[PDB]
């Protein structure tokens, strides 16, 4: 089973941390040395990691029963969540450095309710299947992340979507986190797929893989033949190669920026195409060259 990526332009694909269209590629700020996203994580041979689901219909969603004080969580289909499986139910939002505003609906009832989530207090323990209701009345709900705002705590914090929330309690740590992802070095930096997030600011949500890449990899389960997959970002209309990238087994892409000539300067309507398997230290040409 040869390795492939979907033959679809990036700008028609979805973020994997929220049901949002991809509008650009980007890199992390210099002071972001690593990420540990829990959604949008899938190895190149198709193993889902963290809380990543196959389908965008699960992404950035919660389900549980409120009693007025806490919401006791389940998986999105209603089956029980067990802490040893991950840091939260599958698809649970993983946006750190922000308050969440989740749109709550119910099967069999009329109306939608906004659920405002501060992810810092000792009642926010999704790893134990329990988060504060914050005024959400009793009942069973499905919620989807709708918009974000600056964290309520610490006061004065900015929105910072390079973070993940604290999933554990003030005493017990969330287990089975997806591992961190680091830049490979020697010029290669992580490539992120960006989406505009509604909220009272110019919020941009980064993710490591488009959601459609994830369900493709989960379906294909192509054996990871080499240490890295050399790819071309090609123009769909001409086939012209716009730059070399590497995809790594843990499930992320890199390039060598030279800079106002990084992946953000490339068009967003291009297609990633697998070229061959290469060594970890295969030296990429700089973007633009």
């Amino acid at each position, epitope marked *: 089973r040869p390795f492939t990526l979907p033959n679809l332009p990036l700008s028609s694909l979805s973020n994997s941390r929220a049901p949002l269209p991809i509008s650009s590629m980007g890199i992390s700020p210099d002071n972001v040395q690593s990420v540990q996203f829990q959604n949008g994580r899938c190895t190149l041979d198709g193993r889902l990691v963290g809380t990543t689901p196959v389908s965008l219909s699960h992404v950035a969603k919660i389900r549980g029963t409120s009693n007025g004080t806490v919401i006791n969580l389940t998986e999105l289909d209603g089956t029980p969540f067990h802490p040893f499986e991950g840091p939260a139910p599958i698809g649970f939002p993983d946006l750190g450095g922000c308050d969440w505003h989740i749109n709550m609906t119910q099967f069999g009832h009329s109306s939608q309710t906004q659920y405002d989530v501060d992810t*810092t*207090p*000792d009642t926010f323990v999704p790893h134990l299947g329990s988060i504060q209701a914050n005024g959400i009345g009793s009942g069973n709900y499905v919620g989807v992340l709708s918009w974000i705002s600056p964290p309520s*705590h610490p006061s*004065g914090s900015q929105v910072d979507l390079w973070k993940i929330p*604290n999933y554990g*309690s*003030s005493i017990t740590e969330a287990t089975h986190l997806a591992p961190s992802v680091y830049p490979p070095g020697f010029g290669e930096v992580l490539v992120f797929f960006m989406s505009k997030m509604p909220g009272p600011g110019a919020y941009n949500l980064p993710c490591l893989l488009p959601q459609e890449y994830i369900s493709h990899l989960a379906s294909e389960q192509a054996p990871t033949v080499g240490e890295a997959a050399l790819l071309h970002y090609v123009d769909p209309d001409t086939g012209r190669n716009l730059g070399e990238f590497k995809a790594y087994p843990d499930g992320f892409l890199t390039c060598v920026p030279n800079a106002s000539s990084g992946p953000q300067q490339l068009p967003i309507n291009g297609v990633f195409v697998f070229v061959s398997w290469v060594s970890r230290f295969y030296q990429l040409k700089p973007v633009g060259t």
Partner: antibody, heavy 122, light 114 residues
Framework: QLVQSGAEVKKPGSSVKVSCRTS????????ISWVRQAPGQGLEWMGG????????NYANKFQGTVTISADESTSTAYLEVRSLRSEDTAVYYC?????????????????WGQGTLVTVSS | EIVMSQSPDSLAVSLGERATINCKSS????????????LAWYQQKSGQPPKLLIY???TRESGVPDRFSGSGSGTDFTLTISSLQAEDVAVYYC?????????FGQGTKVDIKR
């Protein structure tokens, strides 16, 4: 240690500007809040400013009629209250709390001014 | 906003007896990251600005007589005057400084019972 300006009488609909001066050390290491207290009532936080970062915030009910400012050269914070009504008759307190960064000022109140009485009446 | 609720509204306790004042916050003020409760207690006598008694829920402010103590965690907090003295007649307020806006309880008036 927080020195407030004198009592004021204002007619309904007018505006009042109340000052709070402190030492320069306190001014550049603290957030300066304004807390008011209607006669025989509780304490109501109106808003605050961190002078060295020039960031402000306000409680929802005082948004639009209240502005809080700071003068770095005189170490003085100001509270301006427009569209005054009778229910705005209160003692307006200046209060400080530690502020190490723009996102690191979640601290209990440090000092209090002696208060400034604002009587709104005809 | 985090709403602070105190109980009782007023308290009358005989000299040398213990006064307890409860405070509940509508949302936990216990930051998981540092394990601190962002809660303070103040004393206000008429004509005066409030005075800090307790901070971080249980830490006694320097100069406060040690018959003042604070306890509780998360959403439920308690101020206790273990042996009330005449100079403690005042209004007591709890306050969260976890988030903006800062909010106080409605206050609890403590008088000497006779």
């Amino acid at each position: 240690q927080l020195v407030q300006s004198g009592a004021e009488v204002k007619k309904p609909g007018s505006s009042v500007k109340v000052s709070c001066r402190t030492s320069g050390d306190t001014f550049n290491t603290h957030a300066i809040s304004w807390v008011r207290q209607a006669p025989g009532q509780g304490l109501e936080w109106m808003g605050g400013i961190i002078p060295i970062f020039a960031t402000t915030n306000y409680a929802n009910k005082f948004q639009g009629t209240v502005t809080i400012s700071a003068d770095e050269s005189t170490s003085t914070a100001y509270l301006e209250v427009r569209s005054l009504r009778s229910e705005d008759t209160a003692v307006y307190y200046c209060a400080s709390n530690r502020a190490n960064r723009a996102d690191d000022y979640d601290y209990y109140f440090d000092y209090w001014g002696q208060g400034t009485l604002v009587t709104v009446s005809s | 906003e985090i709403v602070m609720s105190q109980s009782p509204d007023s308290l009358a306790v005989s000299l040398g007896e213990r006064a307890t004042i409860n405070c509940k916050s509508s949302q936990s003020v216990l930051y998981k990251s540092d394990k601190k409760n962002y809660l303070a207690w103040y004393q206000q006598k008429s004509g005066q600005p409030p005075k800090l008694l307790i901070y971080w829920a249980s830490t006694r402010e320097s100069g406060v007589p040690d018959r003042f103590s604070g306890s509780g965690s998360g959403t439920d907090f308690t101020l206790t005057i273990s042996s009330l003295q005449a100079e403690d007649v005042a209004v007591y307020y709890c306050q969260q400084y976890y988030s903006i806006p800062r909010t106080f309880g409605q206050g609890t008036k403590v008088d000497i019972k006779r």
